[PDB]
Amino acid sequence: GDGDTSKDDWLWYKQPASQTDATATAGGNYGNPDNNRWQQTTLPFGNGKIGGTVWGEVSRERVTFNEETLWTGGPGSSTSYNGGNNETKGQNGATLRALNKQLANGAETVNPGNLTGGENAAEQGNYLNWGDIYLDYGFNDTTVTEYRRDLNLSKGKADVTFKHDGVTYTREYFASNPDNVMVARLTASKAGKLNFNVSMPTNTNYSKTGETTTVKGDTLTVKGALGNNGLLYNSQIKVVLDNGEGTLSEGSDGASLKVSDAKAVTLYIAAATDYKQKYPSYRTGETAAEVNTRVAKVVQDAANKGYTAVKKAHIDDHSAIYDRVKIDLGQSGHSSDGAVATDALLKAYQRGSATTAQKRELETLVYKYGRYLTIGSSRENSQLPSNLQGIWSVTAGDNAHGNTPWGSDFHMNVNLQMNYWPTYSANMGELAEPLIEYVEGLVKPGRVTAKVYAGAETTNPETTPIGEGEGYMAHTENTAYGWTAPGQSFSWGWSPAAVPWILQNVYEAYEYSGDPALLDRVYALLKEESHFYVNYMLHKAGSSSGDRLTTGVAYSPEQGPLGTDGNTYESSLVWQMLNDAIEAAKAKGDPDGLVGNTTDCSADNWAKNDSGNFTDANANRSWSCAKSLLKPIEVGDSGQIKEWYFEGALGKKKDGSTISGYQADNQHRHMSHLLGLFPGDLITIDNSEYMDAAKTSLRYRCFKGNVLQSNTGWAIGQRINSWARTGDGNTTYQLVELQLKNAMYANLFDYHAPFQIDGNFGNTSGVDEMLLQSNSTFTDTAGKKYVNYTNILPALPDAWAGGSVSGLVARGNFTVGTTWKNGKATEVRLTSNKGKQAAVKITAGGAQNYEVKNGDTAVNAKVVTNADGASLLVFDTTAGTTYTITKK
């Protein structure tokens, strides 16, 4: 039994998916109404590896099915797979070198069009919908009463119930991480009334070799190999009748199992491929028989444990993570008097008829869903991080840019980053593990790309540890198979700062934990990528970009000239990487002596000969020196953050002429030059000069006249987080409102359109950043610095006058709870998990007005103040202790 579910968080609906509103914009690849219905109406669950999306149909029930490693492309997709790298284009770095020389000699722009790769869509591949589980009850009439379908976010399961011709039928679905198995629990209220056919057809749109569907005893097996690349796949459904009551027989089609005259059944569903994240073969080495044996043991082991035990272990595991964070903004819920279904709730929110409690319900549900979706798509033992769709998809085809939008891939120039923005602050740090492994997984294939396009060759690349090579390069479109080449067209295909950027998400695993094992891993990654940038990528700018190091030829997605002499986007990212790398080094005592200093530090130190080697072997090219020479931020003549170093007024060059390709209405969708504001620490509340300029930049991008503009997907996700960092909670909240009104389907999937999970994760992160920030550095008037200080309620919306949150995490590894009333903090609970010095700003109240206690015991806390009158409480902590901060 479920017991008391009154306090659980539910998405819920009074009708099946087929009857649920799917009228929002469908987007590319969703012209088929059935596929569009899937993305707008079905309810997801997963264990980080396998996933389902539940339709809740009355008679022909459907659970769309996924496994995270079902990927076309990679080795075996051609006779020459090499991660997309094109030697003729790269010329071992010569192409890039010559373009940079043109810029260094004074060109304002160049044509970087030859910097491409990745031409074969069959080699690139994409993520596939595996297929579907169908449970066909064979009802003559679909007419029912007492229908409900729900997703219980608290217990990590989907439910369906209805009454048909006097009989109540129930369904429950979950995917257990501990037991690595999907469970469907099916009941009828009257004995003999549970009758259904179970099948598991693979998606009919990808090519296959040697697929069979067979029944033996209580188990249905579908197995074969992908036609595109020979990847082996195997799924099994084991049907277990309660008390042996009922009859189990082979379906008349020979491709299904028939349950007759039963009352209750448990289905155990498992699936696997022979994928392995192992360069260059990307296979386990198992035979089809071995995969089959492995999957069979999963379902048998689960059945042996039994439904009650498997369910208990699942709910314990799921809730252990899910229940870490609680948030109370005054929301209604499914147990409230006059509770409204989630689709009805969304509609009311859109129409402006939702009550305050209902608005808070939708806002907190969407927030919580981002956490839920992390648990479902990204577990410690996932083989791959969440992709553009987490793990959930209905579309499939063999080739990239085919039947599935953007291949449901790893899009590493904002999207994958966004997937891992709430992971730490929302107390799910362990769930970043597959991202860390993925980025480690880019090193071997990326060393090939680094050699081809930048001339950075690692000798003995197989045995040279991460950190000790010459560099690894990867771009926007990535896959399960080390597709680290740039894409076929420069504008969208080339973006080597994607690696620096994703390294930010990786380094945050250390920032938020203080875990020395993570420190070693992130340091190794940062060491080699910093080596790569310092030695191969950076150059002294030509006259168009002033006196600084830049990253050479660069595009600012997705406006302006194709190739300028660096830009704010790339310089902000490289600056942040070197900053993180220096911090990682310092935390280890700089054993490699790479931090250096700014003594005899000049962009002239980067001088190279015709072959691309430094002419001065002994010049200072240390991380500190390189970082100091980027000068990534310049405020322009419109008080804006410059996007290009040749910029004067907004969208203009210093001579007043047009920046060709700049979107003249100032409302370009990308804000690539603001990554230093979010996620970075280049532009923070502690630097008014830069922050005022960033706010000006944001206003031009986000407003048409005086009206704040809606956006969708990654763009709205980015804007929410960016505005949160400014401290303007009202504008930030207004963007959350716009996301909910204009970028959420009935099942609360974020849309671009089509469905893109990035914005779901971006929402959760954005709410976190409104309530807690921990990325900035405070400087008191005596000059003392407090790095990564805990900032309570930095961008609290006036719309949320009172509330509480518990279980957020701040950098330095502090768990944070806060309660507020009339727009001001009444309590902060700060749990020090690692014993680091506490430094606490209370934006909504002023920390100087508060005092710190350990239970009843007064804690010595110094008040420090900066030049603008902002204060911190500074105090020692001990790991394991919670400190309570209240008004004096």
Q: The dihedral of CA 667, 668, 669, 674: what is its sign?
A: negative
95 vs 382 by CB, closer to Ca ion? 382
Nearest approach, Cβ of residue 480 and Ca ion (Å): 10
Angle between helices 498-511 and 516-532 (to 10 degrees): 160
384 vs 584 by CB, closer to Ca ion? 384
Radius of gyration for the chain, computed over Cα atoms and rounded to the nearest angstrom: 28
20 vs 382 by CB, closer to Ca ion? 382
136 vs 317 by CB, closer to Ca ion? 317
Considering only the stretches 58-66, 67-75, 247-255, 762-770, report the one whose residues sit in contact with Ca ion under the rule CB under 5 A.
67-75
275 vs 623 by CB, closer to Ca ion? 275
Considering only the stretches 65-73, 329-337, 485-493, 661-669, report the one whose residues sit in contact with Ca ion under the rule CB under 5 A.
65-73
* Residue 511, annotated as binding a ligand: yes
Give the tokens for residue 462: 């197989």
Nearest approach, Cβ of residue 481 and Ca ion (Å): 15
List the interface residues with Ca ion, window 280-309 (CB under 5 A): none
Whose CA is closest to 792, among 834, 833, 847?
847
127 vs 507 by CB, closer to Ca ion? 127
Q: How many chain residues bind Ca ion (CB under 5 A)? A: 3
How far is residue 24's CA from residue 30's CA, in Å, rounded to a whole number?
Answer: 11
How far is residue 453's CA from residue 577's CA, in Å, rounded to a whole number?
Answer: 21
Considering only the stretches 64-72, 207-215, 473-481, 492-500, report the one whose residues sit in contact with Ca ion under the rule CB under 5 A.
64-72
Give the tokens for residue 104: 């260094």
CB neighbours of 718 closer than 8 A, spacing ≥ 6?
414, 418, 671, 678, 762
Nearest approach, Cβ of residue 266 and Ca ion (Å): 25
How far is residue 887's CA from residue 73's CA, in Å, rounded to a whole number?
Answer: 60
Nearest approach, Cβ of residue 386 and Ca ion (Å): 6
382 vs 551 by CB, closer to Ca ion? 382
Whose CA is closest to 641, among 563, 726, 706?
726
Give the tokens for residue 836: 């680091």
Nearest approach, Cβ of residue 69 and Ca ion (Å): 8
Give the tokens for residue 888: 């004096």
211 vs 380 by CB, closer to Ca ion? 380
* Residue 543, annotated as binding a ligand: no
How far is residue 131's CA from residue 620's CA, in Å, rounded to a whole number?
Answer: 57
50 vs 262 by CB, closer to Ca ion? 50
Nearest approach, Cβ of residue 431 and Ca ion (Å): 10
194 vs 502 by CB, closer to Ca ion? 502
Considering only the stretches 63-71, 398-406, 647-655, 674-682, report the one whose residues sit in contact with Ca ion under the rule CB under 5 A.
63-71
332 vs 382 by CB, closer to Ca ion? 382
Q: Is 245 buried (19+), middle (13-18) or exposed (0-12) by CB count in 10 A?
A: middle
Task: State yes or no: cis peptide before 679, omega within 30 of 0.
Answer: yes
Q: Is 554 buried (19+), middle (13-18) or exposed (0-12) by CB count in 10 A?
A: buried
Q: What are φ and ψ of residue 305, in 5° steps?
A: -70, -35
Considering only the stretches 36-44, 61-69, 719-727, 784-792, report the one whose residues sit in contact with Ca ion under the rule CB under 5 A.
61-69
How far is residue 43's CA from residue 433's CA, in Å, rounded to a whole number?
Answer: 25
384 vs 716 by CB, closer to Ca ion? 384
The answer to whether residues 832 and 814 touch, using CB atoms and an 8 Å cutoff, is yes
Considering only the stretches 95-103, 374-382, 463-471, 847-855, report the one whose residues sit in contact with Ca ion under the rule CB under 5 A.
374-382
Planar angle of CA 242, 243, 246, nearest 5 degrees: 70
Whose CA is closest to 43, among 146, 130, 149?
149
**Residue from 67, 68, 150, 758 in contact with Ca ion (CB under 5 A):** 68
* Residue 68, annotated as binding a ligand: yes
Nearest approach, Cβ of residue 385 and Ca ion (Å): 6
Nearest approach, Cβ of residue 393 and Ca ion (Å): 12
| 667 C-beta neighbours (distance < 10 Å), count | 13
382 vs 697 by CB, closer to Ca ion? 382
Nearest approach, Cβ of residue 106 and Ca ion (Å): 48
Lay out the site mask for Ca ion across 376-405 (x = CB under 5 A, - = otherwise).
------x-x---------------------
82 vs 764 by CB, closer to Ca ion? 764
Nearest approach, Cβ of residue 420 and Ca ion (Å): 12
3 state DSSP class of 644: coil
Amino acid present at 724: A
CB neighbours of 288 closer than 8 A, spacing ≥ 6?
223, 225, 232, 234
| 586 C-beta neighbours (distance < 10 Å), count | 10
Nearest approach, Cβ of residue 458 and Ca ion (Å): 29
3 state DSSP class of 175: strand
Nearest approach, Cβ of residue 660 and Ca ion (Å): 42
69 vs 556 by CB, closer to Ca ion? 69
Beta strand ranges found along 378-425 (DSSP E)? 410-411
Helices (H), 512-593: 516-532, 568-587
* 272 lies in the binding site for Ca ion (CB under 5 A): no
Task: Give exposure, 287-315, as e/b (b: 16+ Cβ within 10 Å).
Answer: eeeebbeebbebbeebbebebeebbeebb
The answer to whether residues 754 and 778 touch, using CB atoms and an 8 Å cutoff, is no
Planar angle of CA 744, 746, 747, nearest 5 degrees: 90
Whose CA is closest to 277, among 586, 68, 86, 114?
68
Nearest approach, Cβ of residue 133 and Ca ion (Å): 19
CB neighbours of 306 closer than 8 A, spacing ≥ 6?
none
How far is residue 216's CA from residue 25's CA, in Å, rounded to a whole number?
Answer: 44
Task: State yes or no: cis peptide before 75, omega within 30 of 0.
Answer: no
Nearest approach, Cβ of residue 387 and Ca ion (Å): 7
* Residue 119, annotated as binding a ligand: no
The answer to whether residues 632 and 571 touch, using CB atoms and an 8 Å cutoff, is yes
3 state DSSP class of 646: coil
* Residue 165, annotated as binding a ligand: no
How far is residue 80's CA from residue 71's CA, in Å, rounded to a whole number?
Answer: 18
Nearest approach, Cβ of residue 67 and Ca ion (Å): 9
How far is residue 313's CA from residue 176's CA, in Å, rounded to a whole number?
Answer: 8
Residues annotated in the binding site for Ca(2+), as ranges? Answer: 68, 377, 384, 511, 681
Q: Which spans of this chain sit near Ca ion (rule: CB under 5 A)? A: 68, 382, 384
Residues annotated in the binding site, as ranges? Answer: 68, 377, 384, 511, 681
